[model samples]
Target: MISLIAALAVDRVIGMENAMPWNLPADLAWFKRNTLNKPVIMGRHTWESIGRPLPGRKNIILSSQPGTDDRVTWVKSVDEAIAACGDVPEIMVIGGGRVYEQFLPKAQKLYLTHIDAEVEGDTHFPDYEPDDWESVFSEFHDADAQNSHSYCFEILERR
Candidate 1:
């Protein structure tokens, strides 16, 4: 199966300048718990943003075309990336806009961190209608000292 995950702003912004605008420990824990031991696919830009491979998950970076990248395996296409996931129950599509656009059509589930704030950004999430997906799980988190960002956890599945 295919899935997409992202941390977004109230205006659906994903990143400000190739990095998250804010941080939240709860959200980080949520992401780590959810993606551990799974394969994660992302665009070259997204991969670069992260700077290194996540310890427990297989990181596959999609470029314009596949090439050798030791830190991660680079695929030429989203379909190719998904195919590379082997028998994993779900392949996590983690991303920047270009990567998300490529996989949105095939995403069966979305684990999103919906921030309760907004900021001007160059990258934006693609348009998704509520009717197209069902919110199966949701939990709200209030701002705290460390992260100081109010956000919500949402798990959605295609309708």
Candidate 2:
């Protein structure tokens, strides 16, 4: 099983000069809840921002070739990445626009944190039809002291 995870503003702004546009600790916890120990595949730019592999689980990136970089594995393309995930049942593509779209149609589920603000960003999310999926779970949160923006975490499974 493969899934995509993203935290974006209402305008689909997922990044601003490689920075997460808002501070949402609640979302971070939400991220790790679904991501830990799961094979995570991300884009090259997001890969650079992390600076290293996640603490636990298989780290994968869509680079120009297949090889290992520290604790992460670099694969040339989406299909190549898919081939590499044969041993695992769950793969999470966490990232920016291009790779999101590249794997969008293929991912079975989506874990999205839709924020209330329409902020500026250099990278945005790829658009997809919501009607194609069933909302298995969703929770909304108000902008509290620690969270910079109000957000809704919605999980959609393909219908």
Candidate 3:
């Protein structure tokens, strides 16, 4: 299975200047929970934004650069990255806009954090038809002093 995960604001803004525009520890934690021990595919820009491979997951970057390490694999295309997953039942596409767009069509599941506020950003999550998928799970969160915005964690699977 291939899954794509992201947190986007009401405006569908996912990032600004190659980095997340918000600081939500809970959302970050949620991402970690879902992706831990999975093979994570991302674009070269996304890998560069993150700076290092996320611990406990195999980070595969779509890049022409030649490099490999215990935690990271650099590939030129999405198919090559997915092939590296071998028998792993699920691979997570952790993004930048282009990476998300590339896998959105084939993704079996979507893990999305819908932030309640609008934000201006350079990157946006691709729009999809709600009719094509069904929300399997959704949990609402209220904004507190620490968390800047109210949000909902939603999991959508193809209908």
Candidate 4:
């Protein structure tokens, strides 16, 4: 199944200047817990924002200017990324709006971290109806030293 994973602010803002606007280790920890050992897809900006391949996962990079790297498989289109994940149980789409918007329609699962605060950003997660999804899992965490904002980690499946 195709899945999209991301952490977005309450306003659905996801990024600023091609990177996440906030730093929350709890979200990062859960991001890995969800995507680890899975075939993950990312666009050029998202891949470059992270600056390196994620540990213990197939890093599928989407870009026009391909790079020669043993750590990742470079593809120039979204179709190529989908084709690369043949017969997999899960395809994790981690990226900017360019990648997210395309997969949002066909995605079966969403692993989302909803941060409880508004923030500034240039990128936003695509708008959708909560009624269309069934919450399969969720856990709320309060702000602490490592995390500045309270948040909820939720796993939603298309209903």
The C-alpha stretches of model 2 lying farther than 4 A from their native spots are 65-68
Candidate 3 segments exceeding 4 Å error: 68-71
Error of 1 at 106 (Å): 0.5
lDDT of each: 0.86, 0.86, 0.90, 0.90
Clashing pairs in 2: none
TM-score per model over all chains = 0.94, 0.93, 0.95, 0.94
Model 4 steric clash total? 0
lDDT of 3 at 6: 94
Residues 100-156, candidate 4, lDDT per residue (tens digit)? 998899899999999998889999999978899999999999999989999999999
Please write out the lDDT profile of model 3 over residues 65-106, one tens digit for every residue: 776554688888888988988899899999889999989999
Instruction: In angstroms, give how far residue 6 of model 1 lies from its true place.
Output: 0.6
Q: Per-residue lDDT for 67-156 in model 2, tens only?
A: 557577888988888887777878999986788988888989999999998888888888889789999999999998899788999999
Each prediction's Cα RMSD? 1.3, 1.5, 1.4, 1.3
> What's the lDDT for residue 153 in model 2?
97
